[PDB]
């Protein structure tokens, strides 16, 4: 799971 | 029972869905269409399956794709696009419904990624993050995929816990997806005779 | 200057560029250009109402070609599509130089539907560009969207021939790309013409070196053996595939056809039994023949072979696997299953076999759910869940049981009891707060909500979730407020009739609470719209994106995608529930510290959205165009005739005087569903009404309608018997549909005070008819229906 | 790898340890007790049995650092596996991570009291090297129920 927050 | 198949556009909303029950991390639908826009042919679903037997329109719920077929489990798949490496990959996402977990699910959707990066985007490697505190996403990666550690990230999800970056290298041969028909004579289609013999 | 701010917009200094702007019209106020560019800086600082009164300004004064341009571009910017087509075009017709305007037309004529004009716009940029590849492919995507599928391929083929020998590395993935799409529009052509398809063949045997689509490669291939009658060529690529993806359920059947024995359970039987040797862990050589065995006990025994391996394992998803089995053959595969499961069972110890006997009871528990028979359904769960307690699927299925049973307060909390035991576990979080959803506990609901999103600027999760486009939680908690709106109803009706005094405290207290339900039950399906709306506009990115990618195929199927958005469950889903609020606005219109609370609902940030409550959207004085604008429209002009409401057709058009749309609705949906069906009944019995002198619509719709309902429906209506006071419709529709036939029951209840045919006896019809059905739906309609 | 494996406790999954203690010892912990493990002096040791990846038991123990006789060391504040699950070494494996703990951080005792009544779990000690130290500790065990009851101390002695 990638977060594109950071 | 759980059929896989590659995914299409048709599925992004039904994917997205499946994410948004599943994990923390979600994104807009933007990000899907980018996702199975660019990388076509990288991504899988895995859906129930009604099929006719010897002896309607779609269900009103956010899981249905079809009559009788609803997305249990995804796998989202891209290529890495940032600025000069080898080529590589990235698993942007994977989740399976609850109730439909501990079948092989996951294992089969991630077999099929793996193999896709690198046959059809000749991947070197893939990476992905994924939460310390994560037992069932650890033992798939780390124990049935042999993803490596590739280092800890600190802080790195919304609510603070720490990820491990995780790293696999890709070869075609070993990916085939024959090598992991017999979970233990393993017998193969030598796709020559007539199966009827 | 005014071109130190053009480059200075460019340039993200915005600001900067707007001191500079600000300068020129104190000497200048009429100033054209310096009007527009205002505009859309401002629009890039979210400045959004000034930059609307700025560009409105610079209209109104006329233009130059940058002037042209910059409106092109903010118009695009605020979605609207064919004013950006008009300022382009503008700045090409007053002198413009910039060939790119072609691509930014192309990119919006695409986005409009114009692919008529999009080919011509992609023809300019071609010639403009013939340097770069994806001026080449968009154009022959164009040439192809217009039918012009030669020319497509032409141009793709002339292409090729000038990057013969020319082709990077880092170029290959895209070639691929449009090799396979040429293929595809070869292939479209061909149809079933022998030679034209034995071309396409060459043209696949020929590009499958530099084509790394391998499984959408074979799958053309397999096809186009098929086509040309070449069967045994056919199976080969299907075992082929079979081999590539052996989970593939359509590469099975397929298959089968290519061998012939499709209708020969014999030879089936035998494919299945070798398939499995190759493929012992995959779900379609176990069962297929779980689809045509009829053979009680060789059915029995591969049923067994299925099922007991996955419970000796422990798979959760054991039932739901064979679900489909009990569906499409109940009578034939319950009983057999339910033996050889029980029989299974009996041999198990709890604490030397501890793993299939927990999911053995599961599996157990789900079969009696299945079949409708609780308090079996519970005993097997319980004994699961008194052995190992610490599986969060046992309070699942628990709770599950509870739910058909009504129990939905119940349900609610074992289900709570589950998210306790794994708060990591996002998916146990959503299933719960569905469940206080479904007991109308919007409170409890949002607080577990909030725990797994972003909420960073807000005392809880509302307004991530409407970030997120979560239609699956907005969906479900405005279908809560319309019913607590329901039930507040209910307790302000009741209230005033026991006025026989802070009564009048406590109806004032009421009525603000249906207000607020009413409300917020409708903004929250209104909610839905603006997501797929949002999702139609994110196509525009793509008509210039895909090109530069090379990935022709997929963007075509985007096309597709974006014309049926307006059709997808979530969207109908809402349209429909939201209907129920909008006709009876219609109907009806026929007949403080708040401050506090605001925040806690609150969807939308502050400045886009004063009407929390949707207080607006429930006192329109135009109901019916608001759900046209904001659901119907959409949904009407892309939906299929094979799936089209007409019900829900009939009703809108009902409330719009439009008599004769309602007759084509009916008609179409009895060409569907035939004229036995009690909806058909009942949508005719309530037109038939509606022709009735006496009634608020127009004479000359009665008319035509009264014609068209005896042109078709005399032999199935006593049409001349709306004149008879003593015609008991009621026994008739019983007569004809019979008393069980509850949706169509429930149609003439709806239309009760337009079309009185004895609500007393009506209401009472549908109470007996109940008796069939689970308790929660005998619950729900006497609760939320009646 | 082995069908039995021990693994953390973090503040996620805290209800799971808190359901195994409440079906495997009604009646002495007060949930609070639980939330205080994961509420940020006095330092904890937790961690869950898992069987075939399902959680079937867990430990909750204590570094007890200091005045005091010879009951410092490590105290054992819960230990406890599903009914179904006993007899498969995994109630053994819980009481090692415990005694492996006291080790670490170089102390030598590691000790438990019981309900005085608890003869089974008691030999269950003893078997395991425990021993007891003095007798029945008059009612030092407090129920939820407000209930009480006398204790005995067990002790065992680690190299
Ligand atoms: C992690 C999952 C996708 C696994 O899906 P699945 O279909 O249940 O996996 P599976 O049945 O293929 O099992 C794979 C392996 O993991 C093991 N496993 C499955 N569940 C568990 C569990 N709860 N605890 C420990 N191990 C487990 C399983 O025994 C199998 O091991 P082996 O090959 O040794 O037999 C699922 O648990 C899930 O969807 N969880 C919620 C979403 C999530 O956390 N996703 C992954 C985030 S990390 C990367 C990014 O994205
Ligand atoms: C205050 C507090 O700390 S909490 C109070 C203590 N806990 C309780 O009172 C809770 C209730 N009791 C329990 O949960 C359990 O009975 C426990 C924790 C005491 C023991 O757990 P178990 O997992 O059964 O322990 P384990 O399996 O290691 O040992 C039990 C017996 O089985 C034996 N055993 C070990 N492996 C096997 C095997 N493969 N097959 C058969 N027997 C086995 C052990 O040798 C032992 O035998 P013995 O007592 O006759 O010498
Ligand atoms: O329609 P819902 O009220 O949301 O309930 C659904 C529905 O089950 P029932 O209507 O039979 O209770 C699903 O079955 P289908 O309608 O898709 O056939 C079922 O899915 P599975 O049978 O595939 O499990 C799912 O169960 P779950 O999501 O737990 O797997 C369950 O939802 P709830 O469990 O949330 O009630």
Same mark, same amino acid.
């Given at each position: 799971?990638?977060?594109?927050?950071? | 029972?759980?059929?896989?198949?590659?995914?299409?556009?048709?599925?992004?909303?039904?994917?997205?869905?499946?994410?948004?029950?599943?994990?923390?991390?979600?994104?807009?639908?933007?990000?899907?269409?980018?996702?199975?826009?660019?990388?076509?042919?990288?991504?899988?679903?895995?859906?129930?399956?009604?099929?006719?037997?010897?002896?309607?329109?779609?269900?009103?719920?956010?899981?249905?794709?079809?009559?009788?077929?609803?997305?249990?489990?995804?796998?989202?798949?891209?290529?890495?696009?940032?600025?000069?490496?080898?080529?590589?990959?990235?698993?942007?996402?994977?989740?399976?419904?609850?109730?439909?977990?501990?079948?092989?699910?996951?294992?089969?959707?991630?077999?099929?990624?793996?193999?896709?990066?690198?046959?059809?985007?000749?991947?070197?490697?893939?990476?992905?993050?994924?939460?310390?505190?994560?037992?069932?996403?650890?033992?798939?990666?780390?124990?049935?995929?042999?993803?490596?550690?590739?280092?800890?990230?600190?802080?790195?999800?919304?609510?603070?816990?720490?990820?491990?970056?995780?790293?696999?290298?890709?070869?075609?041969?070993?990916?085939?997806?024959?090598?992991?028909?017999?979970?233990?004579?393993?017998?193969?289609?030598?796709?020559?005779?007539?199966?009827?013999? | 200057?005014?071109?130190?701010?053009?480059?200075?917009?460019?340039?993200?200094?915005?600001?900067?560029?707007?001191?500079?702007?600000?300068?020129?019209?104190?000497?200048?106020?009429?100033?054209?250009?310096?009007?527009?560019?205002?505009?859309?800086?401002?629009?890039?600082?979210?400045?959004?109402?000034?930059?609307?009164?700025?560009?409105?300004?610079?209209?109104?004064?006329?233009?130059?070609?940058?002037?042209?341009?910059?409106?092109?571009?903010?118009?695009?910017?605020?979605?609207?599509?064919?004013?950006?087509?008009?300022?382009?075009?503008?700045?090409?017709?007053?002198?413009?130089?910039?060939?790119?305007?072609?691509?930014?037309?192309?990119?919006?004529?695409?986005?409009?539907?114009?692919?008529?004009?999009?080919?011509?716009?992609?023809?300019?940029?071609?010639?403009?560009?013939?340097?770069?590849?994806?001026?080449?492919?968009?154009?022959?995507?164009?040439?192809?969207?217009?039918?012009?599928?030669?020319?497509?391929?032409?141009?793709?083929?002339?292409?090729?021939?000038?990057?013969?020998?020319?082709?990077?590395?880092?170029?290959?993935?895209?070639?691929?790309?449009?090799?396979?799409?040429?293929?595809?529009?070869?292939?479209?052509?061909?149809?079933?013409?022998?030679?034209?398809?034995?071309? @396409?063949?060459?043209? *696949?045997?020929?590009?499958? =070196?530099?084509? &790394?689509?391998?499984?959408? +490669? $074979? /799958?053309?291939?397999?096809?186009?053996?098929?086509?040309?009658?070449?069967?045994?060529?056919?199976?080969? @690529?299907?075992?082929? *595939?079979?081999?590539?993806? =052996?989970?593939? &359920?359509?590469?099975?059947? +397929? $298959? /089968?056809?290519?061998?012939?024995?499709?209708?020969?359970?014999?030879?089936?039987?035998?494919?299945?039994?070798?398939?499995?040797?190759?493929?012992?862990?995959?779900?379609?050589?176990?069962?297929?023949?779980?689809?045509?065995?009829?053979?009680?006990?060789?059915?029995?025994?591969?049923?067994?072979?299925?099922?007991?391996?996955?419970?000796?394992?422990?798979?959760?998803?054991?039932?739901?696997?064979?679900?489909?089995?009990?569906?499409?053959?109940?009578?034939?595969?319950?009983?057999?299953?339910?033996?050889?499961?029980?029989?299974?069972?009996?041999?198990?110890?709890?604490?030397?076999?501890?793993?299939?006997?927990?999911?053995?009871?599961?599996?157990?528990?789900?079969?009696?759910?299945?079949?409708?028979?609780?308090?079996?359904?519970?005993?097997?769960?319980?004994?699961?869940?008194?052995?190992?307690?610490?599986?969060?699927?046992?309070?699942?299925?628990?709770?599950?049981?509870?739910?058909?049973?009504?129990?939905?307060?119940?349900?609610?909390?074992?289900?709570?009891?589950?998210?306790?035991?794994?708060?990591?576990?996002?998916?146990?979080?959503?299933?719960?707060?569905?469940?206080?959803?479904?007991?109308?506990?919007?409170?409890?609901?949002?607080?577990?909500?909030?725990?797994?999103?972003?909420?960073?600027?807000?005392?809880?999760?509302?307004?991530?979730?409407?970030?997120?486009?979560?239609?699956?939680?907005?969906?479900?908690?405005?279908?809560?407020?319309?019913?607590?709106?329901?039930?507040?109803?209910?307790?302000?009706?009741?209230?005033?009739?026991?006025?026989?005094?802070?009564?009048?405290?406590?109806?004032?207290?009421?009525?603000?609470?249906?207000?607020?339900?009413?409300?917020?039950?409708?903004?929250?399906?209104?909610?839905?719209?603006?997501?797929?709306?949002?999702?139609?506009?994110?196509?525009?990115?793509?008509?210039?994106?895909?090109?530069?990618?090379?990935?022709?195929?997929?963007?075509?199927?985007?096309?597709?995608?974006?014309?049926?958005?307006?059709?997808?469950?979530?969207?109908?889903?809402?349209?429909?529930?939201?209907?129920?609020?909008?006709?009876?606005?219609?109907?009806?219109?026929?007949?403080?510290?708040?401050?506090?609370?605001?925040?806690?609902?609150?969807?939308?940030?502050?400045?886009?959205?004063?009407?929390?409550?949707?207080?607006?959207?429930?006192?329109?004085?135009?109901?019916?165009?608001?759900?046209?604008?904001?659901?119907?429209?959409?949904?009407?002009?892309?939906?299929?005739?094979?799936?089209?409401?007409?019900?829900?057709?009939?009703?809108?058009?009902?409330?719009?005087?439009?008599?004769?749309?309602?007759?084509?609705?009916?008609?179409?949906?009895?060409?569907?569903?035939?004229?036995?069906?009690?909806?058909?009944?009942?949508?005719?019995?309530?037109?038939?009404?509606?022709?009735?002198?006496?009634?608020?619509?127009?004479?000359?719709?009665?008319?035509?309608?009264?014609?068209?309902?005896?042109?078709?429906?005399?032999?199935?209506?006593?049409?001349?018997?709306?004149?008879?006071?003593?015609?008991?419709?009621?026994?008739?529709?019983?007569?004809?549909?019979?008393?069980?036939?509850?949706?169509?029951?429930?149609?003439?209840?709806?239309?009760?005070?337009?079309?009185?045919?004895?609500?007393?006896?009506?209401?009472?019809?549908?109470?007996?008819?109940?008796?069939?059905?689970?308790?929660?739906?005998?619950?729900?309609?006497?609760?939320?229906?009646? | 790898?082995?069908?039995?494996?021990?693994?953390?406790?973090?503040?996620?999954?805290?209800?799971?340890?808190?359901?195994?203690?409440?079906?495997?010892?009604?009646?002495?912990?007060?949930?609070?007790?639980?939330?205080?493990?994961?509420?940020?002096?006095?330092?904890?040791?937790?961690?869950?049995?898992?069987?075939?990846?399902?959680?079937?038991?867990?430990?909750?123990?204590?570094?007890?650092?200091?005045?005091?006789?010879?009951?410092?060391?490590?105290?054992?504040?819960?230990?406890?596996?599903?009914?179904?699950?006993?007899?498969?070494?995994?109630?053994?494996?819980?009481?090692?991570?415990?005694?492996?703990?006291?080790?670490?951080?170089?102390?030598?005792?590691?000790?438990?009291?019981?309900?005085?009544?608890?003869?089974?779990?008691?030999?269950?000690?003893?078997?395991?090297?425990?021993?007891?130290?003095?007798?029945?500790?008059?009612?030092?065990?407090?129920?939820?129920?407000?209930?009480?009851?006398?204790?005995?101390?067990?002790?065992?002695?680690?190299?």
């Amino acid at each position: 799971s990638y977060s594109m927050e950071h | 029972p759980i059929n896989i198949r590659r995914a299409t556009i048709n599925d992004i909303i039904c994917m997205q869905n499946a994410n948004l029950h599943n994990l923390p991390e979600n994104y807009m639908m933007k990000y899907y269409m980018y996702h199975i826009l660019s990388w076509p042919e990288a991504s899988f679903v895995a859906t129930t399956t009604t099929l006719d037997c010897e002896d309607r329109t779609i269900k009103l719920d956010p899981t249905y794709l079809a009559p009788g077929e609803k997305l249990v489990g995804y796998v989202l798949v891209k290529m890495n696009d940032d600025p000069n490496e080898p080529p590589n990959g990235h698993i942007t996402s994977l989740s399976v419904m609850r109730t439909y977990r501990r079948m092989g699910i996951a294992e089969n959707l991630m077999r099929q990624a793996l193999f896709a990066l690198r046959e059809v985007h000749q991947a070197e490697y893939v990476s992905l993050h994924v939460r310390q505190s994560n037992r069932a996403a650890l033992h798939l990666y780390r124990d049935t995929l042999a993803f490596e550690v590739l280092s800890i990230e600190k802080s790195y999800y919304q609510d603070g816990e720490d990820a491990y970056a995780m790293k696999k290298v890709l070869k075609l041969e070993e990916l085939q997806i024959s090598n992991f028909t017999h979970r233990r004579e393993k017998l193969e289609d030598d796709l020559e005779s007539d199966l009827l013999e | 200057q005014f071109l130190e701010a053009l480059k200075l917009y460019e340039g993200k200094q915005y600001k900067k560029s707007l001191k500079l702007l600000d300068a020129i019209l104190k000497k200048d106020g009429s100033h054209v250009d310096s009007l527009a560019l205002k505009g859309l800086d401002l629009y890039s600082v979210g400045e959004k109402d000034d930059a609307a009164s700025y560009v409105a300004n610079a209209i109104r004064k006329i233009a130059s070609p940058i002037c042209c341009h910059v409106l092109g571009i903010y118009m695009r910017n605020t979605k609207e599509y064919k004013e950006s087509i008009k300022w382009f075009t503008a700045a090409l017709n007053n002198g413009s130089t910039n060939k790119q305007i072609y691509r930014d037309l192309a990119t919006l004529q695409s986005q409009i539907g114009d692919f008529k004009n999009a080919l011509v716009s992609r023809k300019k940029y071609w010639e403009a560009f013939l340097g770069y590849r994806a001026n080449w492919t968009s154009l022959a995507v164009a040439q192809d969207v217009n039918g012009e599928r030669q020319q497509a391929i032409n141009t793709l083929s002339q292409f090729e021939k000038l990057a013969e020998g020319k082709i990077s590395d880092s170029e290959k993935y895209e070639h691929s790309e449009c090799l396979m799409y040429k293929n595809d529009i070869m292939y479209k052509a061909a149809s079933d013409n022998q030679d034209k398809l034995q071309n @396409v063949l060459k043209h *696949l045997n020929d590009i499958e =070196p530099c084509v &790394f689509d391998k499984f959408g +490669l $074979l /799958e053309r291939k397999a096809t186009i053996y098929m086509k040309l009658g070449q069967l045994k060529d056919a199976s080969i @690529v299907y075992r082929t *595939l079979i081999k590539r993806n =052996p989970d593939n &359920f359509k590469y099975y059947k +397929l $298959l /089968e056809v290519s061998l012939g024995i499709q209708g020969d359970n014999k030879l089936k039987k035998a494919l299945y039994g070798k398939l499995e040797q190759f493929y012992p862990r995959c779900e379609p050589p176990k069962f297929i023949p779980l689809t045509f065995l009829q053979d009680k006990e060789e059915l029995s025994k591969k049923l067994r072979e299925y099922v007991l391996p996955q419970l000796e394992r422990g798979v959760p998803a054991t039932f739901s696997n064979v679900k489909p089995l009990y569906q499409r053959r109940k009578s034939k595969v319950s009983p057999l299953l339910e033996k050889i499961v029980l029989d299974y069972l009996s041999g198990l110890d709890p604490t030397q076999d501890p793993i299939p006997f927990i999911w053995t009871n599961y599996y157990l528990s789900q079969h009696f759910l299945f079949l409708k028979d609780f308090p079996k359904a519970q005993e097997y769960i319980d004994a699961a869940l008194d052995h190992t307690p610490t599986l969060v699927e046992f309070y699942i299925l628990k709770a599950r049981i509870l739910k058909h049973l009504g129990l939905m307060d119940t349900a609610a909390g074992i289900l709570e009891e589950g998210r306790q035991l794994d708060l990591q576990d996002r998916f146990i979080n959503c299933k719960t707060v569905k469940y206080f959803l479904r007991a109308n506990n919007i409170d409890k609901a949002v607080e577990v909500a909030s725990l797994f999103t972003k909420n960073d600027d807000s005392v809880n999760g509302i307004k991530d979730l409407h970030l997120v486009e979560a239609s699956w939680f907005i969906v479900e908690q405005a279908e809560a407020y319309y019913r607590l709106y329901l039930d507040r109803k209910k307790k302000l009706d009741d209230l005033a009739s026991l006025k026989k005094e802070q009564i009048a405290n406590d109806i004032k207290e009421n009525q603000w609470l249906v207000r607020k339900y009413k409300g917020l039950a409708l903004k929250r399906f209104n909610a839905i719209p603006k997501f797929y709306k949002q999702f139609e506009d994110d196509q525009l990115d793509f008509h210039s994106y895909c090109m530069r990618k090379g990935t022709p195929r997929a963007y075509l199927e985007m096309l597709e995608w974006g014309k049926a958005l307006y059709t997808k469950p979530m969207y109908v889903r809402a349209m429909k529930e939201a209907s129920k609020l909008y006709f009876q606005m219609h109907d009806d219109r026929l007949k403080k510290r708040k401050e506090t609370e605001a925040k806690s609902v609150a969807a939308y940030p502050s400045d886009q959205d004063n009407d929390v409550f949707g207080e607006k959207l429930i006192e329109t004085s135009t109901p019916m165009e608001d759900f046209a604008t904001e659901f119907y429209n959409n949904y009407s002009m892309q939906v299929r005739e094979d799936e089209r409401d007409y019900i829900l057709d009939f009703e809108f058009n009902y409330r719009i005087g439009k008599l004769a749309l309602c007759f084509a609705s009916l008609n179409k949906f009895a060409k569907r569903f035939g004229t036995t069906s009690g909806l058909f009944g009942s949508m005719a019995i309530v037109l038939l009404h509606a022709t009735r002198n006496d009634t608020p619509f127009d004479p000359i719709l009665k008319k035509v309608v009264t014609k068209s309902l005896e042109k078709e429906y005399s032999e199935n209506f006593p049409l001349n018997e709306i004149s008879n006071n003593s015609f008991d419709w009621l026994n008739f529709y019983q007569e004809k549909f019979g008393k069980n036939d509850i949706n169509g029951l429930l149609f003439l209840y709806r239309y009760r005070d337009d079309v009185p045919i004895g609500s007393s006896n009506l209401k009472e019809m549908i109470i007996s008819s109940l008796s069939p059905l689970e308790p929660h739906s005998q619950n729900e309609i006497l609760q939320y229906y009646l | 790898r082995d069908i039995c494996t021990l693994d953390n406790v973090y503040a996620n999954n805290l209800g799971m340890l808190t359901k195994l203690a409440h079906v495997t010892v009604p009646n002495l912990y007060q949930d609070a007790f639980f939330s205080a493990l994961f509420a940020e002096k006095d330092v904890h040791f937790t961690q869950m049995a898992y069987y075939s990846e399902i959680p079937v038991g867990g430990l909750v123990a204590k570094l007890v650092p200091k005045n005091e006789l010879s009951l410092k060391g490590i105290q054992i504040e819960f230990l406890g596996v599903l009914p179904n699950y006993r007899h498969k070494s995994i109630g053994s494996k819980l009481l090692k991570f415990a005694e492996d703990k006291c080790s670490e951080c170089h102390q030598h005792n590691v000790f438990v009291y019981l309900p005085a009544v608890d003869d089974l779990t008691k030999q269950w000690f003893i078997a395991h090297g425990f021993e007891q130290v003095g007798e029945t500790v008059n009612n030092f065990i407090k129920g939820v129920n407000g209930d009480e009851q006398d204790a005995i101390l067990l002790k065992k002695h680690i190299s």
